[PDB]
Amino acid sequence: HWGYGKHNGPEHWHKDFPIAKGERQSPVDIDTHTAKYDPSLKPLSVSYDQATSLRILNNGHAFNVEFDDSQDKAVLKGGPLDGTYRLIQFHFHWGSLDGQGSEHTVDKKKYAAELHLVHWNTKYGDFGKAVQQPDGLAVLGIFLKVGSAKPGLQKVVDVLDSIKTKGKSADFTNFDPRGLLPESLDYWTYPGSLTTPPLLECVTWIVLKEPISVSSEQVLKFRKLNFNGEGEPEELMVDNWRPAQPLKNRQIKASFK
Ligand SMILES: NS(=O)(=O)c1ccc(NC(=S)Nc2cccc(I)c2)cc1
Numbered sequence: 401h402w403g404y405g406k407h408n409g410p411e412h413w414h415k416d417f418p419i420a421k422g423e424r425q426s427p428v429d430i431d432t433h434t435a436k437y438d439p440s441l442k443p444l445s446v447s448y449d450q451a452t453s454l455r456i457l458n459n460g461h462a463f464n465v466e467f468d469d470s471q472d473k474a475v476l477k478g479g480p481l482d483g484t485y486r487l488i489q490f491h492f493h494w495g496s497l498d499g500q501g502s503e504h505t506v507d508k509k510k511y512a513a514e515l516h517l518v519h520w521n522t523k524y525g526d527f528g529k530a531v532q533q534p535d536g537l538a539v540l541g542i543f544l545k546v547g548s549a550k551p552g553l554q555k556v557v558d559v560l561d562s563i564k565t566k567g568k569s570a571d572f573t574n575f576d577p578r579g580l581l582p583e584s585l586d587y588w589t590y591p592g593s594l595t596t597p598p599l600l601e602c603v604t605w606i607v608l609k610e611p612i613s614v615s616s617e618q619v620l621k622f623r624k625l626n627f628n629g630e631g632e633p634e635e636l637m638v639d640n641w642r643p644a645q646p647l648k649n650r651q652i653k654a655s656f657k
């Protein structure tokens with residue numbers, strides 16, 4: 401199975417998922433001097449006030465906080481998007497050290513971690529149909545740097561003990577994802593892919609300019625999670641990030657001058 405180790409990591413993925421070398425792969429480096437301001441871009445609309453979180457899951461690659469997406473409760477729209485995208489889950493990618501961990505980079509700078517809030521286009525009826533479409537998903541990416549703690553993250557951090565190993569899940573209702581956002585909604589956007597297998601080229605990427613700060617103690621507890629299942633040799637869940645992929649024939653647009 402694919403992973404992030406020496407023998408099954410990002411350099412291996414193309415063998416089972418040929419699209420790894422495709423024309424709109426993610427993540428990418430965001431070159432801030434080359435990204436063009438696009439005045440025709442609309443403000444982002446994040447409507448999370450009716451969000452219903454259900455569960456948190458260690459899936460052996462990261463942990464997912466899952467939401468009830470059987471109704472328009474938590475949706476993303478506007479920006480570069482047409483139509484409504486429902487929140488289905490969010491997850492993080494992070495490093496073994498504070499100097500690495502994000503998937504996207506900004507002028508080659510790596511952040512300590514990166515949050516992905518995953519949304520699917522309601523015109524395709526379910527998530528499985530949506531990932532088969534070029535405009536099927538919208539993922540909102542948010543960088544994390546280490547500094548002051550993020551109060552809105554602590555509920556997540558405190559449950560990680562109960563989902564230490566692969567396949568474990570825990571009840572996680574009444575969590576408000578609005579506590580994970582930065583102040584500004586300024587963003588870059590470009591067409592890309594899932595950053596893990598099957599690497600489908602179905603994503604409109606929306607990456608926020610402003611990082612959130614988390615504490616060293618918060619990211620430390622990320623790093624205490626396990627890739628392996630219970631009763632297996634311990635491998636710490638760290639460096640579950642794919643590095644920057646060739647931009648090729650794409651332009652990154654900025655929502656801001
Ligand atoms: N890291 S990311 O580009 O935000 C991202 C978002 C969603 C997924 N995978 C979803 S949740 N599961 C999935 C998707 C497509 C096919 C299959 I099989 C499983 C995988 C990666």
Ligand SMILES: [Zn+2]
Binds near residue numbers: 491492493516595
């Ligand atoms: Zn991700």
